[PDB]
Design a protein around this ligand. Structure first.
Ligand code: HEM
Ligand SMILES: CCN(CC)c1ccc2cc(C(=O)NC[C@](O)(Cn3cncn3)c3ccc(F)cc3F)c(=O)oc2c1
Ligand SMILES: OC[C@H]1O[C@@H](O)[C@H](O)[C@@H](O)[C@@H]1O
Length: 525
């Protein structure tokens, strides 16, 4: 042994007498070989879920998971079952597919997992400090409560005409439409839908003043900030490049605009119930008496508007794209519009939107086939035992849940790759809590999260924007259906999703051809 330990020291010094080319070679080949050896030893472990084999250390399965995560999940499921782990850019990700996985991740105890440890670098450089994932979970819960106070049924009743006004304004003024001058045209829906989404959301949630700013060069800052909302932030949140300086500058200037309005309303004591800014000005004191700063209010507004921006814009893009090859669905939806709105002689209201089940089923079905968020993550903070298994998920791992994968499984949605709005007949609610409820701080929500359909997540991190999204999408599609027909250019069909973007938006350019149902119809103003 003593002689062996001498030759270890000798071996260590001979390593350094190696030619530098042979040294860097060993610096590479040794981790490769050890990674394989480590995986082979790891597969022996019975308190660990199977780990997907991978050749490149640290990188792991990043390429196949990044580009086609559902195909990746399906292959891993056949080989290993519903629980399995894979390496992703230096992280170990433990996936739990299906309703039991929804339950394991979305209902995990607060002390067991942390969303903000998974997401802080993704969002904080875009939204700003002190909100969403740049704060403890208890602050997030109350921020969600504050925002939900502007998302009441009475708010939605007031938002519907404002959103309708913005859609008609876009049809009238946008170069993509100009309905008073053109009866047919071609659009890229990943151009039109982001613009319609920010116009309708800024007008209703942010209010008249902030919508007005979008008619100026200030809109360029929104574009700059929006570019900053990218999954590259997971690995490179800050780099000395113009991309990041334009983003940071936009965050400062946009939040500065929000703060200017806030401080001006406070100065004049002009604080009503007009928008989410009014609401947060009156309702943003935490339960320990600490008040959100004006900077934090502005940053929360950015986060809310930006999250709702990308999910909603992608979703209305997918609705239009699925309907472009379904003139039968367009026709059905049009008949429902004519019946509910008395041939168009009734103005659309929030109440009447609730009397349009087929419209709401079309949104529901689009969200089944196109979950905007294919993977939701948490960092594991304490060792977690997987029930009915011998598995223990150790702290330092991440858990990954994918309701969007199960949305596309035949076992839960027969013919899952068929767009069929009638699978939701007499089940047209955006979601339906069936039994026991629980309040994490922002209102009672469903205690169970085992539904195979979870477009809005569940548990403490559940979306609070579901009813706003349905309101916004409902008004927008109601008007689209009543005003236009649309179809594909010859030989085109629904594009595949881009799974590497911030949401699973359509791979572009995704073009449709519209035509006015009434070429003589004029939009005033
Ligand atoms: C069709 C549209 C949308 C879909 C499918 C959707 C989906 C989701 C999902 C799956 C989650 C859970 C995230 C997780 O568990 O990690 C979530 C959370 C959230 N969403 Fe949405 N969302 C949509 C629109 C919106 C809108 C319009 C807003 C704002 C008005 C919004 C704001 C939020 C917020 C504040 C959270 C809470 C994040 C947390 O607690 O960690 N979402 N959303
Ligand atoms: C490369 C592919 N991969 C795998 C690594 C990706 C890619 C992008 C993402 C984005 C995610 C994401 O943006 N989550 C945050 C969000 O929940 C979104 N959101 C909910 N409702 C509306 N927006 C949120 C919640 C609250 C809010 F105030 C703003 C928000 F933005 C995510 O979770 O995972 C990802 C995984
Ligand atoms: O969002 C518009 C408004 O909705 C109202 O019902 C809320 O009570 C207000 O706080 C909010 O400003």
């Amino acid at each position: 042994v003593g002689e062996a330990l001498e030759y270890v020291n000798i071996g260590l010094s001979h390593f350094l007498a190696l030619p530098l080319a042979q040294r860097i070679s060993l610096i590479i080949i040794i981790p490769f070989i050890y990674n394989i050896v480590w995986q082979l030893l790891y597969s022996l472990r019975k308190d660990r879920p199977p780990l997907v084999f991978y050749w490149i250390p640290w990188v792991g399965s990043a390429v196949v998971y990044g580009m086609k995560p559902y195909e990746f999940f399906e292959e891993c499921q056949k080989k290993y079952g519903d629980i399995f782990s894979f390496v992703l850019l230096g992280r170990v990700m433990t996936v739990y597919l299906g309703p039991k996985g929804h339950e394991f991740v979305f209902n995990a105890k607060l002390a067991d997992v942390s969303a903000e440890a998974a997401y802080a670098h993704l969002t904080t450089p875009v939204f700003g400090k002190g909100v969403i994932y740049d704060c403890p979970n208890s602050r997030l819960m109350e921020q969600k409560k504050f925002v939900k106070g502007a998302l009441t049924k009475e708010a939605f009743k007031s938002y519907v005409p404002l959103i309708a006004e913005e859609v008609y304004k876009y049809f009238r003024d946008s170069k993509n439409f100009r309905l008073n001058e053109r009866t047919t045209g071609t659009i890229d829906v990943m151009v039109t839908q982001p613009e319609m989404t920010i116009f309708t959301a800024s007008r209703s949630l942010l209010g008249k003043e902030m919508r007005a700013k979008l008619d100026t060069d200030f809109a360029y800052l929104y574009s700059d900030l929006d570019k900053g909302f990218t999954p590259i932030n997971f690995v490179f949140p800050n780099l000395p490049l113009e991309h990041y300086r334009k983003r940071d500058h936009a965050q400062k200037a946009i939040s500065g605009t929000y703060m200017s309005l806030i401080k001006e309303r406070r100065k004049n004591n002009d604080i009503q119930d007009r928008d989410l800014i009014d609401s947060l000005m009156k309702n943003s004191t935490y339960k320990d008496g600490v008040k959100m700063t004006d900077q934090e209010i502005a940053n929360l507004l950015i986060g809310v508007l930006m999250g709702g921006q990308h999910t909603s814009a992608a979703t209305s893009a997918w609705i239009l794209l699925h309907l472009a090859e379904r003139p039968d669905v367009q026709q059905e939806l049009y008949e429902e519009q004519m019946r509910v709105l008395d041939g168009g002689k009734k103005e659309l209201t929030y109440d009447l939107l609730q009397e349009m089940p087929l419209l709401n089923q079309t949104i529901k079905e689009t969200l089944r086939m196109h979950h905007p968020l294919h993977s939701l993550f948490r960092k594991v903070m304490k060792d977690m035992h997987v029930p009915n298994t011998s598995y223990v998920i150790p702290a330092g791992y991440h858990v990954l849940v994918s309701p969007g994968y199960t949305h596309l499984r035949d076992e839960y949605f027969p013919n899952a790759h068929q767009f069929n709005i009638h699978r939701w007949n007499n089940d047209s609610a955006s979601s339906y809590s069936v039994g026991e409820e629980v309040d994490y701080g922002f209102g009672a929500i469903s205690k169970g999260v085992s539904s195979p359909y979870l477009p809005f997540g569940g548990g403490r991190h559940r979306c609070i924007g579901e009813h706003f999204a349905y309101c916004q999408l409902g008004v927008l599609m109601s008007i689209f259906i009543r005003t236009l027909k649309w179809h594909y250019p010859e030989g085109k069909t629904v594009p595949p999703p881009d799974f590497t973007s911030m949401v699973t938006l359509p791979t572009g350019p995704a073009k449709i051809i519209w035509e006015k149902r009434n070429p003589e119809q004029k939009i005033g103003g």
